[PDB]
Design a protein around this ligand. Structure first.
Ligand SMILES: NC(=O)c1ccc[n+]([C@@H]2O[C@H](COP(=O)([O-])OP(=O)(O)OC[C@H]3O[C@@H](n4cnc5c(N)ncnc54)[C@H](O)[C@@H]3O)[C@@H](O)[C@H]2O)c1
Lengths: 250, 254
């Protein structure tokens, strides 16, 4: 994957790990960088545009928890303008096990919904060009932080969903892979307050900076491997192998 | 685990797997067996009672998609009556990838919510007695039926959640294990929808391969309950009961 002159939609582009990935992406001479986030950060947005003014950066206020139909309405406006979109990056997410419904709505349901929305524009069965989906999941989708069981479970779901998307690529023309960051250089809520110090404890352990998580993120996008399950931990980029415990035979 | 004299709540006890599990459960001399299901089934209820009149069987009309406060209200009613509950079984699920929100609400969120509610009565930090939770997940939580990605993902979520619950037992006093059937002959798999109709023949193709009976599944389910192994990930496929080992890809070190 050569990112030059490509059109990219990035959901939650101006947050923590999103912003540093975004900074590197706009340095790659994209034609369009389309940002969809819940709230505007005008300082960050201006800063992004200044990195390379030639890149068309557009911002849409977007809540990932809206129904599929609402996401399709926004996407139609984007496709009407750009004509083509090459990659969708899903980076929405919250970490707060005091918010059970919302954790699920944002991290899991929202990810499924926006994917379903864009498939209506990309599905090759209906004359669509196909496309690429990069889902920001989490290493907690492989093995949980058991003190944030709801967060971890939501990430396990999207690791699964991404895996299946990739296996459906021959039918849909839409490839996908997951980007799974380890702990990246603040305090949050554990489920039923089983551990009030999760953030303090995790951030003391060996971590990585948001800078070369973002650099490894772009490397992963460039590698463009359907069905990859990328681990981005301790400043390295590694593809993990999913264990086969069971087979549907279909 | 001796089931004699125990109090059991079973969410979704009257479906294909549920009813056959229930038939086996009441073979043991349970004290109270409390059924929560979405639709009343007076014939099945009568049948179970007849199996073992020593077991006290009650029924509540219950939808897992209600807010947690509502589930808490029902549990309080039950705990006030029985004083103690020994085991909770969370068995609700739908298979319909035309229903994204509902699949996730029933299969994942609803399971998390009943668990969260019952912890209020059981949590040893509150001076509760602890307890045991058996969660019906799915082999699809290990490896998807990719033509139903949403269902499979919802099951992956609950496998994860159950693993974590079990790891929290030393703190909460509440142990847990997953029950993961393979393809089992019930109405669930008779006819169903794939995501965006990627595979309109999915039910046909799946059932062209070997399956097990709900009877076999229910027998092995109760066997796993009696084994009572915290953190177990039980596979119930082709008539066998087998514990699987979850691969370690990453460790939080906490
Ligand atoms: N049949 C299989 O091959 C298979 C394989 C693996 C896992 N499972 C799982 O086993 C469980 C039982 O499935 P089944 O095969 O007996 O299917 P079923 O359709 O016969 O029964 C589903 C059960 O879930 C209940 N339910 C559905 N929605 C509910 C709601 N909103 N609130 C409360 N209860 C609700 C139903 O009333 C019923 O008791 C499900 O969780 C399913 O995902 C089934």
């Amino acid at each position: 994957m050569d990112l030059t002159n490509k059109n990219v939609i990035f959901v939650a582009a101006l947050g923590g790990i999103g912003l540093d990935t975004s900074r590197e992406l706009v340095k790659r001479n994209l034609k369009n960088f389309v940002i969809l986030d819940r709230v505007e950060n005008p300082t960050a947005l201006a800063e992004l545009k200044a990195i390379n003014p030639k890149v068309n950066i557009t911002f849409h206020t977007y809540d990932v928890t809206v129904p599929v139909a609402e996401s399709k309405k926004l996407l139609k406006k984007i496709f009407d303008q750009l004509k083509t979109v090459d990659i969708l990056i899903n980076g929405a997410g919250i970490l707060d096990d005091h918010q059970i419904e919302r954790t699920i709505a944002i991290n899991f349901t929202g990810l499924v919904n926006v994917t379903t929305a864009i498939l209506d524009f990309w599905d090759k069965r209906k004359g669509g060009p196909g496309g690429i989906i990069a889902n920001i999941c989490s290493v907690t989708g492989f093995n949980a932080i058991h003190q944030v069981p709801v967060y971890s479970a939501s990430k396990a779901a999207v690791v699964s969903f991404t895996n299946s998307l990739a296996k459906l690529a021959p039918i849909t023309g839409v490839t996908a892979y997951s980007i799974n960051p380890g702990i990246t250089r603040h305090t949050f809520n554990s489920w039923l307050d089983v551990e009030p110090r999760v953030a303090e404890l995790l951030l003391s352990h060996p971590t990585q900076t948001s800078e070369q998580c973002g650099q490894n993120f772009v490397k992963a996008i460039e590698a463009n491997k359907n069905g990859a399950i990328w681990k981005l931990d301790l400043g390295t980029l590694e593809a993990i192998e999913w264990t086969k415990h069971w087979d549907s035979h279909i």
